[model samples]
Target: KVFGRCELAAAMKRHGLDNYRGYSLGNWVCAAKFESNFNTQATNRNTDGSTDYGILQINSRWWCNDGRTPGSRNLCNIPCSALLSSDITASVNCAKKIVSDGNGMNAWVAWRNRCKGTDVQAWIRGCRL
Candidate 1:
């Protein structure tokens, strides 16, 4: 299988996110691993019928005007499916922006701070992205 985990880490590094505070790629992977099993294409529907889409589970309605709509721009202003395709780096970067002022490392730190002791479900609770 193509390890999207490695892709995510490399994307983070390319964006100058060398570390998540005191954590390494392994730590970051662990979190993502627990969250969506490193799947770039994932979505969860809330009880209220709201949809959280993509690898980062970004709420399309909140960030993108295109949720379940054909040919809609994403939060990054790209095509909606483009936000969920193999180009998961874009989604991660978008998440970083919402959570860490556009800083990927800071986003990781935020994730760690909020989810270090907890599971992926709890960690994503307050994640703005």
Candidate 2:
């Protein structure tokens, strides 16, 4: 499922990403836009053999257990498949844990390259927050 900008923003807010770890909801929304363009089933295979999944593109190398990524840490303790669901609850929870682990939003390159150090509020402008 592809989520609209506002829809994704609202969903992330509901998942407690708004103002989470000092990052605004727009920051997450912006990162998600570049990470997967709001596509729930999006997956990108890295050259290192790990795969990024879901809207936030959580990686298989250290987050989820894909049963394929070598030496996966499975820090989220959930299957990689869970990240692909349109519901997004699992993905959001895992993302929260990622931040709680002190990785911050930099865990995603998309955020560092695009959302970081930028006025990302435009990503959620005019939305009914």
Candidate 3:
């Protein structure tokens, strides 16, 4: 059966995530809930204000004009706003490619490990992508 937005949101919430709150928000929520439940806004103390943008909390540089490019072809074209506006599946897939090197969930898992406290990396272990 095809899943809709409500179903998706239910699945995410069941895994302990906020309802599709954009890129970084969604990723962080998913990751933290799955791994450690460190659900919170992505932020930093240094020059980087917050690391809440893409599925992996990619930061502003990747999608913003912060000079340093993220090196991802898809990320280069579409910024966070565009990504947020676009289809959830497409955006998440793009993020999966960027973080996982085409491995998708594995990359998400890695992000979950790295950004354990921030709540990035939403792809859990047993969720149909």
Candidate 4:
């Protein structure tokens, strides 16, 4: 599933992304825009031999186990394949754990390079949240 700009914002908002772990919905929207362009089927393999999966691109190195990473921790306690679904519930929940683990949104370089410390409200402007 490829979500439109506002649609993704609305969905993230519904999932309690509003000010989640001190990050706004806009922050999540902006980060995701860069991470996977709101596409649920996206994946990117790291040079470190781990893969990132789904929209938010959760890492196989630490977040989920793909049965391929050399030393996967699977801290989210789920298979990496789960994050590729359009439902996004597992993705969102795992992201929360990522943040709670002291990684915050900094876990994603996309967020650090594009959304962090920026005015991200434009990402969710018309979402009416």
TM-score versus the correct structure, for each prediction: 0.56, 0.96, 0.36, 0.96
- After the best TM-score superposition of candidate 1, give how far the Cα of residue 100 lies from its true spot, in angstroms: 3.0
lDDT of each: 0.53, 0.92, 0.40, 0.90
RMSD of each: 8.0, 0.9, 9.6, 0.9
Clashing pairs in 3: 24-53, 28-119, 28-120
lDDT of 4 by residue, 23-68 (tens): 9888999988999999989999899999999989999999999999
Top model by lDDT, which number?
2
Q: What is the TM-score of candidate 2?
A: 0.96
Candidate 1 positional error at 49, Å: 2.2
Worst 10 residues of 3 by lDDT: 37-46
| lDDT of model 3, residue 121 | 38
Give stretches of model 2 more than 4 Å off: none
**Backbone clash total, candidate 3:** 3
lDDT score of residue 3 within candidate 1: 40
Question: Residue-pair clashes per candidate, as listed?
Answer: 0, 0, 3, 0
Superior by lDDT: candidate 1 or candidate 3: 1
